[PDB]
């Protein structure tokens, strides 16, 4: 079937290589793409090539690359390989791009995902030269049907001087109808509109991105796959974490602090999220609802069994197996899923109104329960804050989940002081590791520290943590949040110098 | 003219001492009180005295004290002296209470002010045994008219098992009409209601707090004063700061990034605010609107000079001169001011929708523009995060303002690394000191550093910050946000060891 159903736009179809020539050195480029789904593929590959060729001849060729969130090898990967990106925002998971960022070759700022559209409209990223957006289809009246994510595509389409569309025949035609795109003022000039979402299954818009066809400078016909990350099978650490979390939910229900259907759930991806979604599928709950950033394997399974009734997200993040399953049953799952603009999926007004339960990963937390989601040793970027801030602060309950150690035991995920902070104490109420669960509601910092050390810290590190804390309590400038500034960051430096946070017994250590 | 206009409730009047006896060791007490305005006074004093006596006889006698925000000597002060508060939330400015907190004798957690009502309903502080609320009057229908703040009072009245009302004759009877108390589910069980505020001057509720009269166990007639802000004027440092900000706003308007009337303004608690407001009072921006937590002296003046049209807040924080001024002209000012529940004034959904400009003070910022609002040397509580987070993260523009130094030049307000973080990089776009303004929008952390160091840092400290940053760029573990962890916190330790951040 013909995917470009607007006859007039067919005249703008052309090869990827030619379309990529529309993108000039210094251009700010907004693209589709969120958790490895729905990013443009062929134009970025052709761009990277021409970039490398330019560079080889001593000619500068770099762009500013603003996305929904993370993309995949064909975009972030190819462009970072070509060294073709001078500035990147707001979220990346590609390893080559991460190396450019951590070497200072690509300037990076990881804005809260729900705020990116707003800040783009305010002009923070400068003037948008190009919007580059992947589509399932173009409708009879020139509407752009998105693919496996919505992200910021509508905002980029509004702002950009020129538009390039990739129509990807790999994406299932029955994605059409799954998106909800609102024409209301979510991220524009104040006063903004009330986003009137009062239930997770509510649609407020329509199925297409809107763009003036006169801005469309090229359409490229493509056929290439998203980045479908291998399924991260839960290990015993992930299963233990999930166990403690599910025990906690069951307890809150039995104490009437949560309904039996819990509240709208936001979860991440990976090992632990997968263990939690598997536990929810088997637990004593019913009629669950997702209001998250992403749809993952475990959510599909609950939508299939009827355990989950609806899942709202901005994107899919599926394994190949799960992708195949939803592709063969898009008719059924399309009725269970709403994909929203990320400035709506990550809207704090909505997250709070709905009372979402936030469940997020972390690099580390300190004994007072300040959380680092991004910067290893305080200076090396992992991925970015993403929407963890959007959700942690706005949620009914903010839960952080992590192995108690990293790097094969050589790093403790509970430290004296976090080397960088993404989520302040006030934005984190519950911590879960494979060692147990700390409930910090209503506690002072010293009381948080007693719970976090006793419930969450690994036994190999707990005596060092207790020693730091005990001595801080005796010696800190103030006793409200006790610290020893002489050693607060010394475990990290110890790791930098020696590859482990564990002390050597050839020198003294108070514990 | 009788303040208690419900005849039947007059039979509940009793002595402050007798009322205090309703409050038992271990109780959770929610009170009125926000920025030194509208907190109960007599029952706390009577309680404090009974607490000391009990301690002497060997009887434990402490409470949990949950407020709107800060109170004053009659409440926080007296209970601190008596050592009668085991836990305190969310915001304190009383010196005696601060000393209990920093000595570890009172447990404190400074929640975001807009979230306190919600967490209290959730059960985070435990069950509320008592709500102790100051009132201007009690209407014929049994409505409780608030005094100089709303705070969390509606929520505490809802939650508490027993209610004590102090009716304070000192408070102006013409406060009645000024408050807007919403019927809706703002902070209750999800799903919450949409709060239909789309304009800062929009009233959506009524003038009184609602409470079941069967829950009222005692009404205490009182007569005692709120705290006042000092009467003290902006010095050359604050005026320099206001000058840079006002120039910034001017450039924004000229570039069409702000309207000529700007956007609703949130002005933080502090003295740099006064400079800023005093600057706006005679600035080129007309038809201004406040959507804030508090009505300061500055705001009152603009409401007077017509330069500001309306101000929404949860509370008053006025000098005695300004207090006298508004109490002479309440009929004028009452039409210009709306006092709301703090979970409405500080609602992130509302703040974002209105597109507030947030202007807040700070202890320090690091060179990457993380902000500390609360904890000196990372461990010693000043006041609390208050509503600075609610507004910083939700605002259209998040501005932080500060002298570039503290303690007569012996502390730099710009440091290699903040000893504690309240506001992350993502929540701070603009910094202003008396040295200049740093516009960080669209910038990576190293780019932020270059702006903050060059524009904001004091000349005494700027070469030292540049030295730290340059060696970090060379030697840091990663280069995205360069640090030398062996010296990131060394300026703070140097201050602890020697009394100054300047090397010998
Ligand atoms: C959609 C949800 C909202 N978005 C976000 O929260 C985005 C920010 N969060 C993230 O990027 C991830 O949650 C985190 C923080 C990287 C953790 O991811 P995860 O739960 O898959 O954790 P995992 O144990 O597999 O480790 C992830 C990587 O970080 C590394 N890592 C984790 N903790 C670490 C630590 N304390 N020190 C050093 N490396 C660490 C680990 O070695 C691996 O590489
Ligand atoms: C909205 N609500 C909020 O933002 C709540 C949190 N914020 C606050 O409490 C205040 O904005 C702050 C952060 C305390 C700053 O207040 P302000 O603008 O009045 O600042 P100001 O220049 O007057 O300094 C206020 C006090 O903090 C002290 N201070 C300020 N910066 C400091 C620093 N870097 N190190 C140590 N003390 C510092 C200063 O000495 C003074 O206390 P003392 O007189 O010495 O007892
Ligand atoms: Cl809204
Ligand atoms: Cl809490
Ligand atoms: Cl709302
Ligand atoms: Cl920005």
Numbering used by the authors:
A (entry chain A): 2 to 512
B (entry chain B): 2 to 505
Quote the passages of the study that discuss this structure, keeping the authors' original sentences.
Acetobacter aceti strain 1023 and other acetic acid bacteria use succinyl-CoA:acetate CoA-transferase (AarC) in a variant citric acid cycle that is required for a robust acetic acid resistance (aar) phenotype. Strong selection for key roles in acetic acid resistance and central metabolism appear to have optimized the structural and functional properties of AarC, making it an excellent representative of the class I CoA-transferase superfamily. Class I acyl-CoA:carboxylate CoA-transferases produce reactive acylglutamyl anhydride intermediates that acylate CoA, forming either an acyl-CoA product and a free enzyme or a protein glutamyl-CoA thioester and a carboxylate product. A closed active site enables AarC to engage, immobilize, and desolvate acyl-CoA substrates and to stabilize covalent adducts of Glu294.
The AcCoA ketone analog 1a, in which the thioester sulfur atom is replaced by a methylene group, was tested for its ability to form a hemiacetal analog of the tetrahedral hemithioacetal intermediate stabilized by the external oxyanion hole. Compound 1a was unexpectedly degraded by microbial contamination, yielding a crystal containing an acetylglutamyl anhydride adduct and a CoA analog (modeled as 2a). Despite our expectations, electron density for Glu294A was most consistent with a mixture composed of both free carboxylate and acetylglutamyl anhydride adduct in a 0.4/0.6 ratio, with a relatively narrow range of B-factors. Since density associated with the 3′-phosphate was ambiguous and weak, the large ligand in subunit A was modeled as 2b. The electron density associated with the large ligand in subunit B did not extend beyond carbon atom C3P, so it was modeled as 3′-phosphoadenosine 5′-(O-(N-methyl-R-pantothenamide))pyrophosphate. An active site acetate ligand was also included in subunit B. Subunit A (5e5hA) adopted an open conformation distinctly different from a partially closed conformation observed for an AcCoA-derived acetylglutamyl anhydride (PDB entry 4eu6A). Subunit B (5e5hB) adopted a partially closed conformation similar to that observed for the glutamyl-CoA thioester adduct bound to acetate (PDB entry 4eu6B), even though 1a and truncated derivatives (e.g., 2a and 4a) cannot form thioesters. A more likely explanation for the difference is the absence of an acetylglutamyl anhydride from the AarC•2a crystals; crystals obtained from AarC+1a adopt an intermediate conformation characteristic of other covalent adducts (lower right quadrant) that may protect the labile anhydride. Degradation of an AcCoA analog by unidentified microbial enzymes produced an activated acetyl donor and acetate, which suggests that ester analogs of AcCoA (e.g., 5a) could be used to produce a stabilized acetylglutamyl anhydride on AarC.
